[PDB]
Design a protein around this ligand. Structure first.
Ligand SMILES: Nc1ncnc2c1ncn2[C@@H]1O[C@H](COP(=O)(O)OP(=O)(O)O)[C@@H](O)[C@H]1O
Ligand SMILES: O=C(O)CCCC[C@@H]1SC[C@@H]2NC(=O)N[C@@H]21
Ligand SMILES: [Mg+2]
Length: 444
């Protein structure tokens, strides 16, 4: 095992990683911004280094500061978690160049799958089903460009090739009105992620978001660990996730799973990753791969027994996969509710001091959060402050337990989305299962 690692993240995921490290006897170095001195994982870590002031650009995105901390503490590896630099290929390259293990894929794999156009091209070659689309960047030649939309059918979506948020997304329905429809997306794309390149694919109108968890050792072994349904979304951000996806048969699971594990071998993937699909009329359509741990990884852990972070660490240490495909079994069902420090109706972020806190407990109840009473949620970072995960022998049991756990959870002093989550668990269509990616915003 790795002697000592830097956790190059914060909040709940930093704590999640610290726990895995402690279990495996790996020493921890918590690097943190000056605003994050009081983070639970910082207080639990073996060593701590303040890497800069509060803004992410000066701390968690500060490559030289993170490397320097890893060097001075004598760490051998860096776990980037999710967000921040986890899918920054230049960071992964630099970490390895500086002589460290990067707990993630090779930098070239990150680049391959981080550019949507090269990603889709790689997936088609591997035999992963994709959304019929432009299969390349968009050009001003409307005589062949606007013929792309006709070939596939309307509506269509304009997506940024370096996009990953509420920017670089544009819904186009009109045939003639496309001589300036590509303008709105390109402006936002260079305004956000400094890359104007955009592509076109079919806007699927009744799809679910179904994604496949993979693990690969980078030695030729690759497994899939069932699927998750993450269809409950607001502004394209997931709110509720569950595993396995309702209605997905063992045969559909193996069909898509086998293709994802083959794609891993084909691209030389190393570590944890997730293939995201739109699922409509019994067909999967690849949209993107997250080349990192997934936020909602706990629901997969609950239904498979596989500790995904510990697996990332064993892989990073050069161990071949400890698990054969035949040994991956889906048992029971799990639901995750993201807990966000934001207003449950207007969604104004709600940073501030938590004056009273009580975590839910019980059989099948899992609570993933750094928050504690007296802790101040800083304004500088993403609003997700915790994740509540409930497991049961079936989906109805998991939901029942979630309803109860959400009622037990106390977070006073700030607004949270707990009231929204309660509403979702209470929604009759959610309870039936199979609601599409447009449902939550329609409900709201
Ligand atoms: N072709 C599409 N048709 C309809 N909705 C889409 C399409 N592509 C993406 N979306 C919506 O955007 C979400 C995120 O898409 P994704 O390609 O993963 O972008 P990001 O990098 O921002 O996560 C999806 O879960 C889905 O709700
Ligand atoms: O505070 C931050 O900015 C770090 C976490 C950011 C959220 C990341 S972005 C990738 C992943 N997907 C999500 O829906 N949330 C995390
Ligand atoms: Mg995505």
């Amino acid at each position: 095992m790795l002697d000592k690692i830097v956790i190059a993240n914060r909040g709940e995921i930093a704590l999640r990683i610290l726990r895995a490290c402690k279990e495996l006897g790996i020493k921890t170095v918590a690097v943190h911004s000056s605003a994050d001195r009081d983070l639970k994982h910082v207080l639990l870590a073996d060593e701590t280094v303040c890497i800069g002031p509060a803004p992410s650009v000066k701390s968690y995105l500060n490559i030289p500061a993170i490397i320097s901390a890893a060097e001075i503490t004598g760490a051998v590896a860096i776990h980037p978690g999710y967000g921040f630099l986890s899918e920054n290929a230049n960071f992964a390259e630099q970490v390895e160049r500086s002589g460290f293990i990067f707990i993630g894929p090779k930098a070239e794999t990150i680049r391959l799958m981080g550019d949507k156009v090269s990603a889709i091209a790689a997936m088609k070659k591997a035999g992963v089903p994709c959304v019929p689309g432009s299969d390349g960047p968009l050009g001003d030649d409307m005589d062949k460009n606007r013929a792309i939309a006709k070939r596939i059918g309307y509506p269509v979506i304009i997506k940024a090739s370096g996009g990953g948020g509420g920017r670089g997304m544009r819904v186009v329905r009109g045939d003639a009105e496309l001589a300036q429809s590509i303008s709105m997306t390109r402006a936002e794309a260079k305004a956000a992620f400094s890359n104007d390149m955009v592509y076109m694919e079919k806007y699927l109108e009744n799809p679910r978001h179904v994604e496949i968890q993979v693990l690969a050792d980078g030695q030729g072994n690759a497994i899939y660990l069932a699927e998750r349904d993450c269809s409950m979304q607001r502004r394209h951000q997931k709110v509720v996730e569950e595993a396995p996806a309702p209605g997905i048969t063992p045969e559909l699971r193996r069909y898509i799973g086998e293709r994802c594990a083959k794609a891993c071998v084909d691209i030389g993937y190393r570590g944890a990753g997730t293939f995201e699909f739109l699922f409509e009329n019994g067909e999967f359509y690849f949209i993107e791969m997250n080349t990192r741990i997934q936020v909602e990884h706990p629901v997969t852990e609950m239904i498979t027994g596989v500790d995904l972070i510990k697996e990332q660490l064993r892989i990073a240490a050069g161990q071949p996969l400890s698990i054969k495909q035949e040994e991956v079994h889906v048992r029971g069902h799990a639901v995750e509710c993201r807990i966000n420090a934001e207003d449950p109706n207007t969604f104004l972020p709600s940073p501030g001091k938590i004056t009273r806190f009580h975590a839910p407990g019980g059989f099948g109840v899992r609570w993933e959060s750094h928050i504690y009473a007296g802790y101040t949620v800083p304004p500088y970072y993403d609003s997700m402050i915790g994740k509540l995960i409930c497991y049961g022998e079936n989906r109805d049991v998991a939901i029942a337990r979630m309803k109860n756990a959400l009622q037990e959870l106390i977070i006073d002093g700030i607004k949270t989305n707990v009231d929204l989550q309660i509403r979702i668990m209470n929604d009759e269509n959610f309870q039936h299962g199979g609601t599409n990616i447009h449902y939550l915003e329609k409900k709201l």
